[PDB]
Structures are given as structure tokens and as C-alpha cells.
């Protein structure tokens with residue numbers, strides 16, 4: 001089997017991407033944030049604290065003839081931005097782009113933190129990291145991809161995120177029309193539960209490539225590109241007036257600037273992030289200070305190849321027995 005679904009930016013900045021997902025019988029379609037940095041499929045629901053729901057579409061398990069409460073199971077997750085959610089668990093039928101999994105764990109939110117409530121466009125998360133990170137207790141559950149793997153034509157999914165435009169998640173096949181040149185594959189460590197890999201270096205604009213190993217994760221659920229402080233300083237030094245602002249929480253730059261590109265290495269191959277992809281707009285409405293899309297990971301503990309980086313590429317998440325990642329230009 002295969003599936004193919006369009007993913008759409010939630011706003012004019014590409015702050016996140018939503019993909020429609022069918023849950024239950026008859027189908028209830030919710031717009032979920034596909035997140036290769038986590039491993040829980042959770043949804044706003046009829047069980048979510050009413051004051052914490054503000055415009056989202058909810059899953060109502062009592063209206064699904066295939067929903068079954070997973071007795072005694074609970075979940076609770078917190079994300080790198082400090083947001084969090086928790087609740088109970090159903091199994092139900094879940095379909096993405098024509099690919100169906102029966103008995104998928106659908107984690108129903110009882111509580112969500114303020115940033116989820118305040119974002120009316122995201123109805124939940126669909127985790128695509130390794131199932132070892134799944135938070136369901138006392139019986140850990142498998143991701144949608146893990147459940148689908150046996151049935152897929154090939155044990156892979158691909159992320160093709162757009163810049164200010166829709167893109168595609170495909171399951172079970174590699175669309176050879178969706179990228180240019182060749183896909184360069186690179187090793188993955190699953191030890192932390194992430195799609196963790198090592199970039200071979202970077203360049204700023206037209207500058208020379210610096211060969212240096214940068215360990216990090218491919219994370220579709222993180223908006224920005226978080227890299228070591230040395231790398232980030234080298235980037236922003238090429239933008240007149242750019243500075244790190246402790247009050248804002250990162251590098252800012254004059255909105256009048258034209259930003260340089262940023263290149264990262266995948267083996268001997270190179271992925272170029274155009275400068276425009278690094279502009280996240282005014283720090284507050286009407287400000288002439290703009291927020292940068294490349295930020296320091298120094299306070300995180302891990303480097304993160306988030307959407308800023310991934311949307312410059314066609315990315316293969318190869319879930320074979322020994323997983324690998326593939327990157328191509330597009």
C-alpha cells in the first residue's frame with residue numbers, strides 16, 4: 001500500500017504545516033501537525049477541557065463505531081517549546097492520504113497547554129519519530145508509520161515541505177518526479193528515538209564550505225534551524241545590523257536586509273537554503289526588527305534541522321531495519 005497527502009502551512013510564515021487525517025467511522029477529518037520529532041498521535045477531542053478548546057476541530061470517539069477505549073492507558077507529553085498535553089487513549093481507524101491503519105492508538109487530549117489552545121489551525125499531532133518515544137502508559141504504543149510499515153510497498157515516508165506553499169507527505173514510495181538530481185542517504189542513530197544524523201558541514205552565502213560534523217535531528221515539528229553557536233554567529237555576521245537579543249530570545253536582523261543563503265552538507269552533497277527562507281518577519285506587528293530563522297541550539301542540548309532546513313529538500317525517512325535519511329534538492 002501507499003498514501004499521499006498534501007501538507008499546508010498554517011500561516012504566512014510557515015510556522016508549521018497541517019495535513020488532513022481521517023479518524024474513525026464515519027471519518028472525522030482533523031488537521032494534524034506531522035512531527036518527525038515526536039511519537040504520539042494526539043487530538044483535540046470531545047474530552048478536552050472546554051476552556052482549552054478555541055476553534056479546533058475535535059475528535060468525538062463516541063460518534064465512531066470503530067473507536068475503543070484502551071483500558072487504563074494515559075499519555076502525557078511535553079515538547080521543546082515548553083508546550084504540553086495529556087489525556088486518555090482510544091484505538092480507532094486512521095487514514096492518511098488513502099493509507100489506512102486499523103487499531104491505531106489515538107491519544108485523546110484531556111488537557112492542553114496555552115499554545116495549543118491559542119492555535120486554532122492545529123487539531124493535534126501525528127508523531128513520526130521512533131515508537132520508543134511514545135508516551136502512552138502503561139503499554140507504549142506504535143506510531144502510525146510503524147503500524148503501517150508491514151503493509152507499505154517500501155518502509156519509507158517522505159517529507160516535501162513547501163516554502164509559502166503546500167507540499168506533500170508520501171508513505172510507502174519515493175516520487176522520483178519530486179526532486180532534482182540524486183538522493184544522498186546518510187546514517188541515522190535511533191538511540192535517542194529521533195531521526196538523528198550527522199551533517200558534514202556548512203557554508204554561508206557564497207562563502208567556502210566548512211567541513212565539520214554537526215549531529216542533529218530531522219524534525220518537521222520544529223519551525224526553525226537550530227545549530228551550534230559558532231555556526232549561527234558566522235551566519236548572522238554576514239547580515240548588517242543583525243544581533244542576538246536576549247529580550248527577544250534570539251537573533252534579529254533589520255527587516256530591510258536581504259539575507260544570504262545557508263548551505264548544509266549531507267555526505268558529499270549540499271542542500272542550499274535560500275536567504276528568504278530564513279526571514280521570519282517582524283518580531284511584533286509593525287516592527288522593523290525581524291526574527292531570524294537560524295538560531296543557536298546552545299540552550300537546547302541538540303541541534304535541530306527543523307522546517308527551515310527541511311523545506312529546502314526532498315527528505316526520505318527510511319524506516320528499514322537499519323533506518324537511514326535521504327536528502328535531495330528540489
Ligand SMILES: NC1=NC(=O)c2ccccc21
Pocket residue numbers: 035036037038079080081083125219220221222223
Ligand atoms: N517537534 C516539535 N518541536 C517543537 O517545538 C514542538 C512543539 C509542539 C509540537 C511538536 C514540536
